[PDB]
Amino acid sequence: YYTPKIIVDYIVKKTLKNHDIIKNPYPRILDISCGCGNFLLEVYDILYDLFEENIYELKKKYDENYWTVDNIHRHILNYCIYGADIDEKAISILKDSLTNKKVESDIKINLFCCDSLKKKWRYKFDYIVGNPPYIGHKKLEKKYKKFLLEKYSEVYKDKADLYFCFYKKIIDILKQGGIGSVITPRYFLESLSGKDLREYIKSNVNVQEIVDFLGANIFKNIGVSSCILTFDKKKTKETYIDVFKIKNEDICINKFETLEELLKSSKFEHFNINQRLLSDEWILVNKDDETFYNKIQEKCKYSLEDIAISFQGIITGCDKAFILSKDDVKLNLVDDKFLKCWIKSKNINKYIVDKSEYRLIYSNDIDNENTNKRILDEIIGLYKTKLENRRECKSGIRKWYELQWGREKLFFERKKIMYPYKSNENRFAIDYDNNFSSADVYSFFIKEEYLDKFSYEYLVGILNSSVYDKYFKITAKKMSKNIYDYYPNKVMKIRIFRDNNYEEIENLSKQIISILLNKSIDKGKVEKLQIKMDNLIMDSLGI
DNA sequence: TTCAAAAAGTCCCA
DNA sequence: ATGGGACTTTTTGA
Numbered sequence: 410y411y412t413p414k415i416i417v418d419y420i421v422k423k424t425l426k427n428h429d430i431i432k433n434p435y436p437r438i439l440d441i442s443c444g445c446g447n448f449l450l451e452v453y454d455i456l457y458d459l460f461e462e463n464i465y466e467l468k469k470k471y472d473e474n475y476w477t478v479d480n481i482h483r484h485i486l487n488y489c490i491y492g493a494d495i496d497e498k499a500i501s502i503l504k505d506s507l508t509n510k511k512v513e514s515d516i517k518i519n520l521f522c523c524d525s526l527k528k529k530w531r532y533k534f535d536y537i538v539g540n541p542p543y544i545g546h547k548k549l550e551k552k553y554k555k556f557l558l559e560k561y562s563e564v565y566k567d568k569a570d571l572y573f574c575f576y577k578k579i580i581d582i583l584k585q586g587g588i589g590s591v592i593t594p595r596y597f598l599e600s601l602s603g604k605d606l607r608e609y610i611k612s613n614v615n616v617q618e619i620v621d622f623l624g625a626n627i628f629k630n631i632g633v634s635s636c637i638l639t640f641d642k643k644k645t646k647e648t649y650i651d652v653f654k655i656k657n658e659d660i661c662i663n664k665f666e667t668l669e670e671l672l673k674s675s676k677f678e679h680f681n682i683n684q685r686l687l688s689d690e691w692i693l694v695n696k697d698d699e700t701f702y703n704k705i706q707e708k709c710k711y712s713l714e715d716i717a718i719s720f721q722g723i724i725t726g727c728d729k730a731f732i733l734s735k736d737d738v739k740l741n742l743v744d745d746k747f748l749k750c751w752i753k754s755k756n757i758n759k760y761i762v763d764k765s766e767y768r769l770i771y772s773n774d775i776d777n778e779n780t781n782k783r784i785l786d787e788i789i790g791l792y793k794t795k796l797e798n799r800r801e802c803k804s805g806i807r808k809w810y811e812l813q814w815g816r817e818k819l820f821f822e823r824k825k826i827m828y829p830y831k832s833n834e835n836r837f838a839i840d841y842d843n844n845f846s847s848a849d850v851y852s853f854f855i856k857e858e859y860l861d862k863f864s865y866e867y868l869v870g871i872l873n874s875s876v877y878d879k880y881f882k883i884t885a886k887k888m889s890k891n892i893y894d895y896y897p898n899k900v901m902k903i904r905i906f907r908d909n910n911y912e913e914i915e916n917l918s919k920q921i922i923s924i925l926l927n928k929s930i931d932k933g934k935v936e937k938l939q940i941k942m943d944n945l946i947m948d949s950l951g952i
Numbered sequence: 953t954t955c956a957a958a959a960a961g962t963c964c965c966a
Numbered sequence: 967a968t969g970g971g972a973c974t975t976t977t978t979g980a
């Protein structure tokens with residue numbers, strides 16, 4: 410959880426580089442989750458140089474006895490550096506580190522061992538920097554979540570993250586005219602959960618700059634995707650955001666001595682976004698992509714949500730109790746009426762699904778424990794303890810052997826389209842085989858009233874096109890290197906069109922499906938057909 | 953009653 | 967041992 414030095418230096422310089430120490434020699438710089446002091450120790454160094462280089466100007470303008478080089482260390486610690494953290498061992502270490510910068514009478518260091526989200530803050534701050542804790546909805550303590558939902562409701566609801574609240578706290582205790590700079594996960598820029606947080610930021614601070622590392626691995630051995638947000642409360646009217654979006658996610662961050670060298674390089678693209686034009690969604694793309702995205706949005710008269718019914722897959726609550734290999738001998742104990750075909754996200758390709766290798770025991774259809782005791786005793790019951798610990802079993806809503814969220818079978822046992830929940834690219838397939846799946850695969854079918862306007866074959870044709878792959882990724886939620894979330898909260902917002910190319914687009918899609926399903930697959934002709942279809946779609950959308 | 957979101961992902965190997 | 971690639975469960979609030 411140590412922040413790389415190149416990033417820490419950038420964040421501290423972002424807040425302090427243009428501070429007028431002559432005009433205000435008492436800046437308050439705060440790290441609200443300071444830890445061992447990665448940021449605060451750097452703040453000390455930047456401040457010490459700033460005072461030392463202007464010591465004679467300060468001595469002349471103010472108390473000439475107070476402003477001496479020998480007094481800089483005491484002045485910084487008494488008036489300038491502030492830190493908070495729940496870990497007292499970390500605070501104890503940081504207090505010694507700040508004390509040892511000088512090496513008389515004891516100096517008072519403004520370090521607080523507390524919950525920053527609970528501390529009564531007695532004053533606001535000129536500059537706030539740091540790296541807050543990230544805790545999601547599963548890993549956050551439930552008693553603590555009751556407090557967040559009560560006191561941080563403006564940014565924390567439902568599946569929100571703890572670091573949303575730190576954004577609220579930082580914004581709230583930032584002084585008028587102050588600057589804040591933090592590194593957090595990037596997901597709030599796009600996630601459904603971040604909607605209220607994005608609204609809070611946009612309407613309370615001026616966002617100066619967003620550094621989006623997309624799927625690059627900033628923290629070694631940490632599966633998180635990062636961004637750096639810099640914002641102020643200055644009296645400003647232009648309110649444009651500098652956006653630095655990484656171009657190559659494989660870049661090593663230490664290739665340059667400073668992060669500014671990386672941002673100005675070819676490894677990053679830069680563009681500006683007008684904060685006044687931000688909706689509840691933040692479309693952070695360059696001018697070419699915005700033009701591309703807007704062309705499609707205006708041209709398409711329908712969305713998938715308009716024409717389709719979407720649903721999440723089965724959630725058994727314990728897969729090992731209900732999912733068996735189709736060659737497992739224990740399936741001889743299970744009547745075939747209980748057995749469903751089961752696929753994973755890797756089984757979804759463009760246009761068609763791999764033949765399934767697993768079976769789901771649709772245990773909800775087992776009427777009672779004595780009629781099918783063999784299945785319960787020998788297959789499902791091997792995990793009875795874990796099954797009984799599921800929420801709906803402890804409450805009695807669900808029997809110990811039942812699927813936790815078995816949905817409705819009739820939704821799955823029909824022609825439908827399926828796609829993986831996380832993928833590098835658009836993979837929408839037509840399911841012909843009544844496949845069931847877990848929540849790693851999403852499904853939709855077409856509403857009856859739109860069947861004469863849209864066919865499954867036409868839909869997988871355009872949804873798998875290069876145009877729609879780029880189109881979806883403009884606003885999709887970037888998760889990790891080469892992985893986007895394909896979830897209904899964005900997939901169902903995809904807009905679709907219907908025009909004179911409909912018949913030829915549909916016909917090419919049928920050819921691709923026919924080739925994909927034959928014995929000797931010549932994958933090459935599929936690629937040529939896809940190129941022809943992409944041209945038709947670009948012709949249709951005028952790009 | 954029952955939906956769908958959530959990576960400080962998880963796990964393995966060369 | 968690490969960094970990078972393949973692949974993705976069920977807990978949870980609403």
Ligand SMILES: N=C(NCCCSC[C@H]1O[C@@H](n2cnc3c(NCCCc4ccccc4)ncnc32)[C@H](O)[C@@H]1O)NCC1CCCCC1
Pocket residue numbers: 410441442443444445493494495496499523524525526540541542543544550553571960
């Ligand atoms: N995913 C993670 N990553 C690691 C955090 C790294 S973040 C950097 C600094 O941040 C410091 N830090 C963290 N939280 C706060 C905070 N509010 C309390 C948050 C709510 C809470 C409730 C109950 C238990 C724990 C936490 N206020 C001030 N400092 C804080 C924290 O000590 C750390 O050195 N989990 C770890 C989780 C386990 C218990 C201790 C740390 C939290």
Ligand SMILES: [K+]
Pocket residue numbers: 468469470471472473
């Ligand atoms: K003087």
Ligand SMILES: [K+]
Pocket residue numbers: 623624625626627632633634888889890
């Ligand atoms: K990453």
Ligand SMILES: [K+]
Pocket residue numbers: 632961962
């Ligand atoms: K992990």
